[PDB]
A = this chain, B = another copy of it.
């Protein structure tokens, strides 16, 4: 029985991350589309919606997706797609911490291993994935850990799903949080997403950013609080008042690992707030936006934040 290489679609959102990688046509039949071409620091709602509708639409036509993405916001898009993709085939985002034209450019081998991952039958049903520096990382926990390191992407709370050696993956973990077709989030018909902004906390923090998003009518605000999701008093006060009038308010934390818990120093039930768990501010944003498509009920949003 002859060998039959799987069909992998590469959806590009930005420039090239290798530049191509000839060794790919030994492990797969690759076709490419350019969906957008933006620096990922300009990543946005409309790109997310395109990617989710594109993956869900083209599911039938291929064996897996690799998405090439700037590293800056890959962790946000990864998680959005983790929640909105309904396609049962592997979806593997990949990027490069050194540019394709650089010495020891890292994109070529990351792309190789991204395709390996996307062709591996064992990668399906693990959620949307991020493959970087020989590692398969779940889209929920993966975050950018260092501003330059090639090893920067890590799942800082629950670890990676497997490591990649010589084109093979040893999977020892899968995320237990509900993803992809187990979520109720369906963007197939949405033209926009609810407006969710992020305010930082720190000593002497001004409440003017919070007030501005409130006055703008934002659907939700994520607080990147201090410690275990705590807020500077003025920020607290502004966000407490907004919640009494329907603004969703998720307490996250600027602290780079660890859950922002319930039943700690903030009485969320009293105040109408939601605890983000291990979702960092930009990740809590992704889930809050998608939550607000179902409900503005803070008890139900908290539930969503305990399931997804």
Residues of A within 8 A of B (CB): 21, 23, 39-45, 48, 70-73, 76-77, 98, 102-110, 112, 133-134, 144-152, 155, 157-160, 163, 165-166, 170-177, 193, 195, 197-206, 208-209, 211-213, 215-216, 218, 224-233, 253-261, 263-265, 277-278, 281-282, 285
B103 touches A203 (CB 8 A): no
Identify the interface centre among A21, A146, A157: most chain B CB within 10 Å of its CB. A146
What separation, in Å, do the CA atoms of A166 and B39 have in the docked complex? Answer: 21
Chain B residues whose C-beta falls within 8 Å of the C-beta of A227 in the assembled complex: 41, 70-72, 144, 147
Closest residue on chain B to residue A218 by CB atoms: B206
A255 touches B146 (CB 8 A): yes
B41 touches A225 (CB 8 A): yes
Chain B residues whose C-beta falls within 8 Å of the C-beta of A265 in the assembled complex: 39
Chain B residues whose C-beta falls within 8 Å of the C-beta of A73 in the assembled complex: 202-203, 226
A108 touches B104 (CB 8 A): yes
What separation, in Å, do the CA atoms of A102 and B149 have in the docked complex? Answer: 19
Identify the interface centre among A193, A226, A282: most chain B CB within 10 Å of its CB. A226
Assuming the A-B contacts A72-B230, A151-B149, are A209 and B202 also in contact, with contact meaning beta carbons closer than 8 angstroms in the complex? no
Assuming the A-B contacts A200-B224, A206-B213, A259-B163, are A134 and B109 also in contact, with contact meaning beta carbons closer than 8 angstroms in the complex? no
Assuming the A-B contacts A104-B108, A197-B205, A282-B202, are A176 and B172 also in contact, with contact meaning beta carbons closer than 8 angstroms in the complex? yes
B158 touches A253 (CB 8 A): no
Assuming the A-B contacts A109-B104, A159-B173, are A145 and B255 also in contact, with contact meaning beta carbons closer than 8 angstroms in the complex? yes
9 interchain pairs, CB-CB under 8 A: A21-B103, A39-B265, A43-B203, A103-B112, A146-B255, A147-B229, A166-B261, A203-B282, A209-B209
What separation, in Å, do the CA atoms of A202 and B73 have in the docked complex? Answer: 7
Closest residue on chain B to residue A43 by CB atoms: B203
Identify the interface centre among A40, A147, A198, A204: most chain B CB within 10 Å of its CB. A147
The listed residue (B70, B150, B204) touching A133 by CB distance below 8 A is B150
B107 touches A104 (CB 8 A): yes
Assuming the A-B contacts A103-B112, A106-B104, A147-B260, are A206 and B197 also in contact, with contact meaning beta carbons closer than 8 angstroms in the complex? yes
Assuming the A-B contacts A149-B134, A197-B209, are A144 and B41 also in contact, with contact meaning beta carbons closer than 8 angstroms in the complex? no
A261 touches B148 (CB 8 A): yes
A41-B226, A166-B264 known; 13 new pairs, CB 8 Å cut-off, are A39-B265, A41-B230, A43-B203, A72-B227, A98-B109, A133-B151, A147-B255, A147-B258, A170-B277, A173-B173, A173-B174, A206-B218, A254-B254
